[PDB]
Every structure is written in structure tokens, then in C-alpha cells.
From a paper:
[name] is a member of a yet structurally uncharacterized subfamily of the [name] of transcription factors that downregulates transcription of the genes for the BusA (OpuA) glycine-betaine transporter upon c-di-AMP binding. [name] satisfies the overall domain architecture of the [name] with its N-terminal winged helix-turn-helix motif (wHTH) and a C-terminal effector binding motif, an RCK_C domain (regulator of K+ conductance). Binding of c-di-AMP to [name] induces a shift in equilibrium from an inactivated towards an activated state that allows [name] to bind the target DNA, leading to transcriptional repression.
We purified and crystallized a construct comprising only the RCK_C domain (Leu135 to end) and solved its ligand-free and c-di-AMP bound structure to 1 and 1.2 Å resolution, respectively. However, a symmetry related copy is present that generates the dimeric assembly as common to RCK_C domains and as observed in our full-length structure. The scattering data show that the RCK_C domain on its own is dimeric in solution even in the absence of c-di-AMP. The apo and c-di-AMP bound crystal structure of the RCK_C domain show that c-di-AMP binding induces a subtle rotation of the RCK_C domains that results in a widening of the binding pocket. This movement pushes residues Pro179, Gly180, Pro181 and Phe182 (chain A) further out in respect to Trp159 (chain B) of the opposing chain. Thus, it seems that this interface locks wHTHinhib in an autoinhibited state in absence of c-di-AMP, restricting movement of wHTHinhib and thus impairing high affinity binding to the operator sequence.
Numbering used by the authors:
A (entry chain A), B (entry chain A): 117 to 213
């Protein structure tokens, strides 16, 4: 939690529980990327909100809609387990052949 | 952290540290709202990524770009302390009169 910002047991439960980030290392051979989070319609496709990216050893909080996702990037996001499943299919596995 | 998803000390540091959410209760008299996160250009304006909203007692993870912000809503977001300051100015205080 952030020092000198309000604290409570209830807030901590949320921060630690339903808001705990998920993470997925994008495959090195994912070919449909090199495009912005905005262009990729991530929330529409998966339900996820991306909160951070690690790109070539650099961790970026709040990448925003104009950041690009490249193969190999490590994506951090909020959601639930079903969002995770959709993120796995969208970034790595790919429906169809 | 999420059970059966990968864990490490380094990941925990990130989750607990730079990714810890901030939160701000939107003022009840903020008059420029009732508009979607997308329309409000939140990242452009503030640098923030909204991860959750509490609206009239209901907490919503990953509200996404099509959710509306209304006066009184509780917004949760990632960023840094400067993002917090910009969020405070954008949602509540308002530059100018």
C-alpha cells in the first residue's frame, strides 16, 4: 500500500485479492503483434486491463493504450481466471491453426 | 498472488510495490462526468490505468474503456505518485475556477 494514502482492512483485501495482477510471457513466435494495446482491443477481446509490460528487461507500469506489444513481452493485467484464459488464447495459443 | 500461477520473490516485489493500486473517491459534485473512461482519455490526461471502480456499493474489476465514471464513484488505478496528483486534479479539484 501507499504511504500516507488511506488504509483499511477492507481496502487491503481488495488490493491483495481480486486486484492481484495476473501475468503471461507472450510467446516469442506470436506473429500478429507489434501493434498498440488500443489497436489490439484488449479489453474487448479478453476482459483484461493491462497494468504493466516488461520489454527486453525494462518494466513499465501503466503502459497505456499507445504502447506496443511485441513477441516475448511479459504482460501484467487485472481480471479473473477466465480473463487469464482468454489472454492466453489471444496472445499465444491462437484459435484455429 | 494467484494459486497455481508462477510465483517468485521478484514477482511479489512488483505486485506489492510499483503495482500496488492507488484509489481516489470522485467528488459528489464533479460535474464533467457521466462519460466513459475512453471518452475521458484517462491515460492521456493523467498517466493512470484504471483497474477497478466501486459504484453505489458494487466493486467492479477491469471496468474497461466503456465504463462510465459518475460523481461519487471510487476509482482504483495503477501509476505513480505524480499520476495520483494528476488524477486528483482531473476528477475532483479542476484547474481554473
Amino acid at each position: 500500500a501507499h504511504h500516507h494514502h488511506h488504509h483499511s482492512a477492507a481496502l487491503e483485501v481488495l488490493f491483495q485479492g481480486p486486484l492481484a495482477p495476473y501475468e503471461i510471457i507472450v510467446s516469442e513466435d506470436s506473429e500478429h503483434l507489434g501493434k498498440s494495446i488500443g489497436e489490439l482491443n484488449v479489453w474487448h477481446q479478453t476482459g483484461a486491463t493491462i497494468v504493466a509490460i516488461e520489454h527486453e528487461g525494462k518494466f513499465i507500469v501503466s503502459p497505456g493504450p499507445f504502447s506496443v506489444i511485441e513477441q516475448g513481452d511479459h504482460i501484467f493485467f487485472v481480471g479473473d481466471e477466465d480473463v487469464y484464459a482468454r489472454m492466453k488464447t489471444y496472445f499465444n495459443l491462437r484459435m484455429g491453426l
